[PDB]
């Protein structure tokens, strides 16, 4: 789906479907009034009948009107004469996109310049959200349906703005396209079943990506190299599986050579059975989304690759399959981490932090200005912050402050949890430097505490996306692509773009 | 224990025990060094033998040394030569108090001026913490023992500071004694068993308190009156018990006539079986702690009275006993709250938000500038923040910040959780305006959202103390008195005292 | 630590710390009084102030006193003037040791002659417990710790008795040293994590032990040898794992060629996941303790080796790792045991009885006079007898009675449970000769009943140490040395030592 920006009058442009907003009590703003006049008052005449209340996202569809160049006109409600909230705005757009998806229209024109969005500027912010909701809402994962699905009609959507703001709208389109494309890659990887989507499969994907872009080199470290580096924790996790582990390094050099890089570390547990500390059966299929941390890294890279952003970015994907078997790790195993700290593995289902901890030690060789790890780490985060808000912790306030502020602008929000010292004692072990679990209280936090012990060489934040990376049921069961919008926004901020 | 401040020389005072700090270097600050000189290096001489490494809270006790008028000299470790964190400083004080209580001295002097506590001034803050830990450490709940403890010898403690800081150390003792006195009261009500501590009992407690204080008037609304004001949620909660519910009003007029009051609302569920949604048996004895919200309001009120703070403070205590029986509330019951909103009671074990929502409506009549509800509300908060940090939510950023700030200075921390709108819809009911539960995701937060719907009329905040109000096991098992220090400190800030 | 015995006067000896007892009521026995009198009433003067009440294990530390040759004097409470229970006596000792271990002195003198121990000799039995408690208290397992505790200052302890008592206190110290040394070996083996401590590791340890001792021949039977001897039940347990089973034979000829040997059989399940009948995750790490039967025999052997007792001793260690996999035993498998009896494995988590049954058959070839198996066999036993007392069953009343008495004199107690015939029907199988479980009733007993069917050719006894072999939680969590004291004492009894 192509998305473009033009500065012509709404009435003038030839199209399968023209879309304009209507407020409560039949209130037409400037753009919409011009279309009414140009349609010889056909639009205000139908509105007099009361079928459209004007509530945000409500629609009434018209078919072609004399004096117009549009085959169809779609009236969408924009609510009272007030700024819309983010959420309300996005729902208005998806509701539009929803009527268009069911039309035999090859193209559509959105003439929604009169809608104001709250705390959002009228050209960039407004449309960043519209463009992202629209392109992300075309996402289809029909690849394992043996009935090849009916190919859609819609291929082109044009956005109309005034001349003055056109450049700013195009900047929003460019960015949202980048993010939208990164989210599709993320969602594809997340939705892919674990029999096909294993670490080696992920290794192959990184290599292919590396063969497609000039500024990106990829290096894959296998099971033996993981072990040889002294990554005892990473190795312990993966050893129980017939599919061996991979540590994938995706190095994009887009800034100056002396620029200290940004490092993204993503948990890539391609399936999580719990291991010997086996999970219950119910809903275990959703554990294919335990590599969504690694998937959000792929997607963020794919968007920056698209934007050719001027930064150095090193991606590290810690990938393993957590399986039970005759050679799997046992509860009670003590291993030596790459850092030289010893860890008693009291629960083999707290394995994300184990692969992550050696990878964080590994990230030191890059001398980063920031290291962010992204993981579907804890059940406790879902209890804490539910489905809507990413868990965020770090050893540097300004860095967490930056990530927080990026989420607010992307509309992909995080929320900070504290790493107080009182929480550290929960990881105490009678025998090793630390245990890998802190018990049933403060589960998101003690996981954060565990990781922080390995992130002391640099500025570091940690993102628990256990709640935000997929949807468990209903129609829209699947990966969401979060937090690609946040991380991409944070990198955009860093790039001054 | 009686607490006084003096500014005379440590070497000089007549006392059973003189306490001085000693660092890891086997270092001595000014005071300990003066004490050593007055004993011609006898203290340095013992340290040379090396039994005391001076880690925070390690102790070496000595008897009569020549030069000194102190019968005993207690040496306490202060650690690595730094300013101490709060926790460490408090553990130092507790170790001292531990040793002191096990001696037959009627009396002790603390000569601790040399110790620095990180980011706290040497006279007010430093001593607010010391004085609180020492006095709160005196607490004994031995009322149900046949073999009662036979009183400790220690009945007075003198703190030494220099002439100049004396007024400030003294204000710290004043406030600290009020707080420690409020906490003892809160802890007694908490620890009391639920066959003795029921809603009528707490009513009686509150009447006595009314009679004893001139500036305080107490009103007790019984079950019939609760029913008549149309409090459908509150009544539904208490109806299954033989012990009827009470709504207790303690109105303290300490400010001017038309100073807008502060309102504290306490959850006073004196026992929580869960009701028809019965809780499992294990650990249920701890549900006598489900009235720790109300208990912490009593305690803060006591502290305020002792301090004669110039503010109007209205305390509303929402008291019921949650019992299964032939007339108890069913899951699926629909009740009409005092606000007029209807609630479907899907789970009878989410009863605290039910007594609280009617009380929040009741708080509107006092025209408050801040309403703060305190409640042992959700096991989810324990999952979120564990035992160290109180959860905090509200409808007003400045009030929330004020409470956060008060926690930091009181060493009784809270931490904010968001009340985003997307959580709201987890309470939707096909039948009533809302349900009382939102599923297993973001439980602490959804309980806050439930509550915000009854606080739209004023500045409001909510503290979930399920994880900070008591200790589950060990010889430490019992009420902690949190959050009396934060609440008190906030009110002091509001009085500017 | 080195322990010596002297018969000199308490006051007359030069030490870093002299330890003497003080009664409840300020009371001093003879030895305490001579110290007091030599220090010319210093001690008594101090006592008069009332700091030390004299409850058992209470202490008061003094520093250097005119008239004595000790740098420090440690007073320890000894309670009411009666003879102490074992438990109170061992606590007093452990308090003393905890104090001495934080002091910077090279040695200590224990002058505790005046303390009586209920039902024990003032020379041998009293000091067996003292010397063991103090030597076993020295235990540290810190090999997986990056930051270690630097070696203690305390290296030597002297015990003062009167000359008529000396030879017997020395005999107590010597039996207790061997015991403690065996316990340390046992605790090391138990605490080692299962990734390191597997059947092949234990085999290597036995071979090393057989190299260090001329009187010991070791022999190691691997997986295929276990299979070829017809050990269908032993083999089924181990087949699931990447780590193969080992049956370890350690032969100590200390008696005449024609003395019937004593046989000790150890359950050595190095990790127990339950297998296909998989255990829950919670506290599974503790199952590294499932080789504590084997560990306790290793450690009894070391003690027997240290003491050179003149007996024939054969140790048989039945070692396997119980793991789930594509080749693991299934519930419902029927195997043929070495005895020719067939067993239906109805639950794979009842595996210890399976390795042991085959091994009991193997024990026959040595023509033993007694066969004692030692196993962490059943959760039922912890429900039956707690942490304090080992379960004991057998087919001979004299053997059982001998083990019971041994446990009493050693203060490592057991308790007999009945093997009534009525219980044997619980093991009936409609297909095989017997199933390996008999259900929710009499669970420790039916395991006993099970094993007795393989022990008919000799006098036999079975010890279920599931509750006495390790401590679950807190900072004492770890293997205990039990039952090394009982087993060693039983053999001392047999040897007439
Ligand atoms: K996947
Ligand atoms: K109570
Ligand atoms: K072990
Ligand atoms: Mn897991
Ligand atoms: Mn409840
Ligand atoms: Mn088992
Ligand atoms: Zn995982
Ligand atoms: Zn409750
Ligand atoms: Zn076992």
In this structure, what token pair is assigned to residue A373?
């790890």
> Which residue from C332, A411, C146 is spatially nearest to B421, judged by alpha carbons?
A411
Which ranges constitute the DSSP H helices of C260-344?
Answer: 292-307
The residues, ordered by sequence, that sit 6+ positions from C211 with a Cβ below 8 Å of its Cβ are none
Nearest chain A Cα distance for residue C235, angstroms: 15
Rounded to an integer, what distance in angstroms lies between the CA atom of residue B73 and that of residue B11? Answer: 10
Per-residue tokens: C22: 């003080």
Chain B residues within an 8 Å CB radius of C472: none
Q: What are phi and psi of B210, to 5 degrees?
A: -60, -50
Alpha helices in C80-147 (DSSP H): 86-100, 124-137
Distances (CA, A) of A453 to A116, A340, A372, A457: 46, 12, 14, 10
Quick one: tokens of B66?
Answer: 């020549």
Cα→Cα distances C349→A301, C209, C237, C354, C449, Å: 48, 31, 9, 10, 17
DSSP symbol at B475: T
Residue of B39, B42, B49, B106 for testing the chain C interface, max C β-carbons within 10 Å: B49
∠B285-C467-C263 over CA atoms, to 5°? 175
Angle, alpha carbons C234-C238-C240 (nearest 5°): 140
Q: How far apart are CA C75 and CA B434, in angstroms?
A: 68
Q: For Cα atoms A41, A43, A46, give the angle at the middle one, nearest 5 degrees.
A: 110
Residues of A engaging B, defined by a Cβ cutoff of 8 Å:
85, 87, 380, 382-389, 413, 415, 417-418, 420-423, 426, 440-446, 467
Measure B71 CA to nearest chain C CA, in Å: 10
Q: Quote the minimal CA–CA distance from B102 to chain C in Å.
A: 7
The dihedral over CA atoms of A305, A306, A310, A315, expressed in degrees to the nearest 10, equals -20
Rounded to whole angstroms, what are the CA distances from A217 to A211, A304, A443? 8, 15, 37
Query: Chain B to chain C, count of Cβ pairs less than 8 Å apart?
Result: 21
Contact B276, B323 (CB under 8 A): no
Note whether B104 contacts C46, CB cutoff 8 Å.
no
CA B463 to chain centre: 12
From B466, B490, B486, B481, select the one nearest B413 (Cα to Cα).
B486
Q: CB count, 10 Å around CB of A434?
A: 20
Rounded to an integer, what is the distance from CA C344 to the centroid of its chain?
Answer: 33
Which residues on A lie below 8 Å from C286 (Cβ)? 332
The CA distance from C211 to C433, in Å, is 42
Sign of CA dihedral C360, C366, C372, C373: negative
Q: Give the span between the Cα atoms of C207 and A23, in whole angstroms.
A: 88
Closest Cα to residue C206, out of C293, C316, C371, C365? C316
Please state, in angstroms and as integers, the Cα–Cα distance from residue B392 to each residue in A15, B380, B424, C261, C472, following that order.
53, 13, 17, 71, 36
Q: Which residues of B170-182 are buried (b: 16+ CB within 10 A; e: fewer)?
A: bbbbbbbbbbbbb
> Which secondary-structure segment (H or E) carries B398?
helix B397-409
Q: Which of B387, B417, B441 sits opposite A467 (nearest CB)?
A: B441
**B290 is known to lie in a ligand binding site:** yes
Residue C344 tokens, joined: 């239906």
Separation between Cα atoms, residue B359 and residue C357, nearest integer Å: 68
Strand C216-221 relative to strand C156-160, pairing: unpaired
What residues of A are in contact with residue B389 (Cβ under 8 Å)?
418, 420
Please tell me the distance from the alpha carbon of residue C361 to that of residue C338, in angstroms, as a whole number. Answer: 7
Give, as one character, the DSSP assignment of residue C220: E
Q: Where are the alpha helices (DSSP H) in A198-325?
A: 199-210, 223-228, 232-238, 292-307
Resolution (A): 2.2
Closest residue in A to C194 (Cα–Cα): A333
Quickly count: other Cβ atoms within 10 Å of residue B395's Cβ.
19
Count of Cβ atoms closer than 10 Å to residue B257 Cβ: 6
C188 bridge partner residues: none
List Cβ neighbours of B135 (8 Å cut-off, separation of 6 or more).
Answer: B1, B3, B176, B177, B180, B181
Nearest residue on chain A to B421, alpha-carbon basis? A87
Length of chain C: 497
| N- to C-terminal Cα separation, chain C | 24
Contact B246, B200 (CB under 8 A): yes
**Which tokens go with C53?**
């009440």
Distance of alpha carbon B8 from the chain centroid: 34
Q: Which residues on adjacent β-strands are paired with residue C19?
A: C74, C110
Interacting residues of A404 by C-beta distance below 8 A, sequence separation 6+ = A392, A414, A415, A416
Ion ligand 7 — residues with CB < 5 Å: A 269, 272, 290, 352
- Tell me the three state secondary structure of residue B87: helix
Q: Which of B46, B50, B102 sits opposite C63 (nearest CB)?
A: B46
Phi-psi label, residue A372: left if phi above 0, alpha if psi -120 to 50, beta otherwise: beta
Write the DSSP string, A404-420.
Answer: HHHHHHHT--EEE----
For residue C324, list chain A residues with Cβ-Cβ distance below 8 A. 276, 324-326
Q: Which of A327, A431, A437, A454 to substitute to test the interface with C, most C CBs within 10 Å?
A: A431
Distance (Å, whole) CA A174 – CA A165: 14
Q: Which DSSP state fits B213?
A: -
Backbone phi and psi for residue B375, each to the nearest 5 degrees, phi listed first: -160, 135
Structure tokens at A318: 């810690």
By C-alpha distance, which of C323, C241, C331, C346 is closest to C274?
C323
- Best mutation site among A279, A328, A330, A436 for testing chain C: the one with the most C CBs within 10 Å? A330
Q: C-chain residues within 8 Å CB-CB of B50? A: 104
Helices (H), B410-474: 421-424, 443-452
Query: Closest Cα partner for C206 from C196, C222, C194, C220?
Result: C220
In whole angstroms, give the CA distance from residue A139 to residue C69. 88
**Closest CA in chain C for residue A329:** C195
Residue A326 is nearest to which of C145, C194, C242, comparing CB atoms? C242
- Residues counted in chain B: 497
Q: Which helix (H) or strand (E) holds B228?
A: helix B223-228
Cα–Cα dist B455/B446, whole Å: 15
Q: Closest-CA residue in chain A for C476? A: A430
**Nearest-5° Cα angle at A303, A301 to A304:** 65
Annotated catalytic residue: which of B72, B120, B126, B353?
B353
Contacts of A445 (CB under 8 A, 6+ apart): A393, A417, A418, A419, A420, A423, B385, B386
Phi-psi region of B481 (alpha: psi -120 to 50; beta: other; left: phi over 0): left
Phi/psi for C45 (5° steps) reads -60, -45
**Spatial separation of the C-alpha atoms in residues C51 and B101, rounded to whole Å:** 10
Best C142, C193, C198 residue to mutate vs chain A (most A CBs within 10 Å): C193
Residue whose tokens read 């009992």: B201
Q: Give the DSSP letter string of C445-485.
A: HHHHHHHHTT-TTS-EEEEE-TTTSEE-SSTT-EE--TTHH
Provide the strand spans (E) within C379-421.
Answer: 390-394, 414-416
The Cα–Cα gap between B465 and A274 comes to: 32
Q: After which residues is chain A broken (C to N over 2.5 A)?
A: none
Chain length of chain A: 497
Q: At what angle do helices C484-495 and C166-191 cross, to 10 degrees?
A: 140
Answer yes or no: is A351 a known binding residue.
yes
Contact B129, B91 (CB under 8 A): no
Helix, coil or strand: residue C89: helix
Residue of C nearest to A280 (CA): C280
Q: Do B104 and C61 touch (CB under 8 A)?
A: no
Cα gap B36→B38, rounded to integer Å: 5
Domains of chain A by range and CATH?
1-161 (3.40.220.10), 178-496 (3.40.630.10)
Catalytic residue among C353, C409, C413, C482: C353
Positive or negative, the CA dihedral C397, C403, C408, C412 is: negative
CA dist C323 and A477 (Å) reads 35
Contacts of B427 in chain A (CB under 8 A): none
Kindly give, in sequence order, each residue whose CB lies less than 8 Å from that of residue A94, ignoring residues fewer than 6 positions away.
Answer: A57, A133, A134, A137
User: Which residues place a Cβ less than 5 A from the ion ligand 4?
Assistant: A 272, 349
Q: Is C26 a catalytic residue?
A: no
Strand B2-6 versus strand C262-272 pairing type: unpaired
- Chain A partners of B384 at a C-beta cutoff of 8 Å? 380, 383-384, 417, 442, 444
Catalytically active residues of A, by annotation: 279, 353
Confirm if B482 and B418 have CB atoms less than 8 A apart. no
How far apart, in whole angstroms, are the C-alpha atoms of residue C141 and residue C478? 9
- Report d(CA C104, CA C110) in Å as an integer: 17
């Amino acid at each position: 789906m192509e998305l473009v920006v033009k500065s012509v009058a709404a009435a003038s442009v030839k199209t399968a479907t023209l879309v304009i907003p209507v407020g409560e009590n039949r209130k037409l703003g400037a753009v919409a009034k011009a279309v009414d006049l140009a349609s010889e008052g056909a639009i205000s005449a139908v509105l007099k009948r009361g079928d459209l209340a004007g509530k945000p996202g409500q629609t009434l569809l018209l078919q072609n009107l004399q004096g117009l160049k549009a085959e169809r006109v779609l009236l969408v409600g924009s609510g009272k004469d007030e700024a819309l909230g983010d959420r309300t705005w996005r729902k208005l757009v998806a509701s539009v996109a929803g009527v268009l998806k069911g039309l035999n229209g090859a193209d559509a024109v959105l003439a929604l310049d009169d809608v104001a969005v709250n705390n959002r500027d009228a050209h960039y912010g407004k449309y960043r959200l519209l463009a992202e909701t629209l392109l992300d809402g075309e996402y289809v994962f029909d690849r394992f349906k043996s009935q090849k699905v009916e190919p859609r009609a819609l291929k082109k959507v044009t956005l109309l703005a005034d001349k003055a703001g056109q450049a700013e709208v195009e900047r929003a389109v460019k960015h949202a396209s980048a993010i939208a494309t990164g989210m599709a890659f993320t969602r594809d990887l997340g939705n892919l079943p674990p029999n096909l989507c294993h670490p080696s499969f992920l290794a192959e994907q990184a290599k292919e990506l590396g063969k497609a872009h000039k500024a990106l080199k990829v290096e894959v470290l296998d099971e033996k190299k993981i072990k040889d580096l002294g990554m005892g924790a990473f190795y312990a996790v993966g050893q129980g599986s017939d599919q061996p582990p991979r540590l994938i390094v995706l190095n994009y050099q887009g800034g100056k050579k002396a620029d200290k890089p940004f490092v993204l570390v993503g948990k890539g547990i391609t399936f999580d059975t719990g291991g010997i500390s086996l999970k219950p059966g119910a809903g275990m299929d959703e554990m294919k989304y335990d590599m969504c941390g690694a998937a959000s890294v792929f997607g963020t890279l794919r968007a920056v690759l698209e934007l050719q952003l001027p930064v150095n970015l090193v991606c590290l994907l810690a990938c393993a399959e957590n399986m039970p078997s005759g050679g799997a790790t046992r509860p009670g195993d003590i291993v030596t981490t790459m850092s030289g700290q010893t860890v008693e593995i009291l629960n083999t289902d707290a394995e994300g932090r184990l692969v992550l901890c050696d990878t964080l030690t590994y990230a030191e060789r890059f001398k980063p200005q920031a290291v962010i790890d992204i993981a579907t780490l804890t059940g406790a985060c879902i209890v804490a912050l539910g489905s809507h808000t990413t868990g965020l912790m770090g050893n540097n306030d300004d860095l967490v402050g930056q990530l927080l502020d990026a989420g607010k602008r992307a509309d992909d929000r995080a929320w900070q949890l504290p790493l107080f010292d009182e929480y550290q004692e929960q990881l105490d072990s009678p025998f090793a430097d630390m245990g890998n679990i802190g018990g049933p209280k403060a589960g998101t936090i003690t996981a954060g505490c565990f990781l922080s012990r390995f992130a002391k060489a640099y500025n570091w934040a940690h993102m628990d996306i256990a709640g935000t990376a997929w949807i468990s049921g209903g129609k829209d069961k699947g990966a969401t692509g979060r937090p690609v919008p946040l991380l991409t926004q944070y990198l955009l901020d860093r790039a001054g773009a």
